Amino acid sequence: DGLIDPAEPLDRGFMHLKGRELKSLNSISITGLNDGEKVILSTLAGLAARVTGDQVYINEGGPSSVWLKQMQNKYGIPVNTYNALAPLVQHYVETGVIKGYIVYTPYSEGQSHSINVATSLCGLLRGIAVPESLVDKVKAMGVTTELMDVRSYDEKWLYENYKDQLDKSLAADMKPEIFHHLRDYITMTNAFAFYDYNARRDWSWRTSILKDLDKGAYCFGYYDLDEWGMVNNASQLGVSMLPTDQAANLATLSSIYDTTGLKQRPATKEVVTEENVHYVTFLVSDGDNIAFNLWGQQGYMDHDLHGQFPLGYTISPSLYDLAPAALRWYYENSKEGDYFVAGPSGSSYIFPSKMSDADLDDYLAKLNEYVDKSGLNICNILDQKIMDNPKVYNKYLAQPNIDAIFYTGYGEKGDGRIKFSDNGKPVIEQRSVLWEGIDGGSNRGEESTVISQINSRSANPHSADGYTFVFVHCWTKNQQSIKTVIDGLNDNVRVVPVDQFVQLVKQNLGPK
Secondary structure, three states, X not given: XXXXXXXXXXXXXXXXXXXXXXXXXXXXXXXXXXXXXXHHHHHHHHHHHHHOOEEEEEEOOOHHHHHHHHHHHHHOOOEEEEOOHHHHHHHHXXXXXXXXXXXXXXXXXXXXXXXXXXXXXXXXXXXXXXXXXXXXXXXXXXXXXXXXXXXXXXXXXXXXXXXXHOOOOEEEEOOOOOOOOOHHHHHHHOOEEEOOOOOOOOOHHHHHHHHOOOOOOEEEEOOXXXXXXXXXXXXXXXXXXEEOOOOOOHHHHOOOOOOOOOOOOOOOOOOOOOOOOEEEEEEEOOOOOHHHHHXXXXXXXXXXXXXXXXXXXXXXXXXXXXXXXXHHHHHHHOOOOEEEEEOOOOOOEOOHHHOOHHHHHHHHHHHHHHHHHHOOOEEEEEEOOHHHOHHHHHHHHHOOOOOEEEEEEOOXXXXXXXXXXXXXXXXXXXXXXXXXXXXXXXXXXXXXXXXXXXXXXXXXXXXXXXXXXXXXXXOOOOHHHHHHHHXXXXXXXXXXXXXXXXXXXXXXXXXX
């Protein structure tokens, strides 16, 4: 074969399972494929990444093309292009990767979850997932053996029959009408994929699944159907959420082991305080979401205004393991006034206030080492009541590699408080927000409001009143929205990079 036995465990980075070391890419455009073809393609990608370095890339253009070219150019990976699904599938029949198909019923028919059953079985049985309507099409591509018929089954059947064969370091909350995102990584890892959303938001079944995972486990997948409830549910159990159901190509992206260029420039430790100014910094939201990191964030950063003002970005430390080519690109594309912060609330989306003391201690010891590798020393916490939770903020800031917190409260206005850990590091609460229609149609997050707010505050860097941390909602407010604010600010207002803001706060307001 030149294939690795599918029973051999995957390698892991410090945090995440990674595919077999990448040697060649077989790139195919998403254009003109139907839903079933998308499922075939993503489960195939997961097949390949478990057993070979000859891997699949789903090229969606835009940011997807950027990551492909980055791998070609920085890591010397050859790219073969395929103009159609049939020859790509045939290639993987010939190389021995595809052993057959697993037939399922789409969600469009009777709300079947069988797509998830098929996806989780693909890596075990060495099959592609195929809806009944495409069985003859795949047979014509050379995939002639039916490995299993799962049309009548749900994820409870899957778990009852395959729990001990499925990975226990992650599971995936997987919507049955997401076709080409995430399923590759699920098939690669033999993760259990399930959809437990119900109108009751009854959390018993998900709890039962999550409690069966190993200590330090992840839950990949969606959050948007019940965000606070899902994150609370996982965090209380010591489980980390990684928003990933809108991420493509993670199996393949994870397969680069070269970690050159993955350490951010250091946060500055030297800045001269200017008297009689008000200091402002801007930080973009949503960086915990790997799908944002792999799509929207690339376009966001490459706005035509990039570099006209300094800007902070949140990003996921987990990109170090899951998509090093993309993390590398961010750091290489950064301008001097750009600076990256770990997204909510560390290496994954947790509410640290909901974890047990022991689980949070474990989480933070890992975080501390992991951000040393990526240089993501400043962290954004998204949680509730943190400014009144010195236990939690002191535990973060006790870590030698975690140097400051930017706190954005979940459903909290943000009062701009600045507090210090016992060891003298700042915890900086949101003070303005740029967000269209925040709180169900208010004007609190409009450019005109943020301008008025900043311009009303005192130009005194020796007081917390002299500082505004502006949090920027990535989906509604882009670099032009930020520039609009900046262009309205008074002459005594100074817009600074995030790391400078932290040092100014520390030296002007922290212990002497």
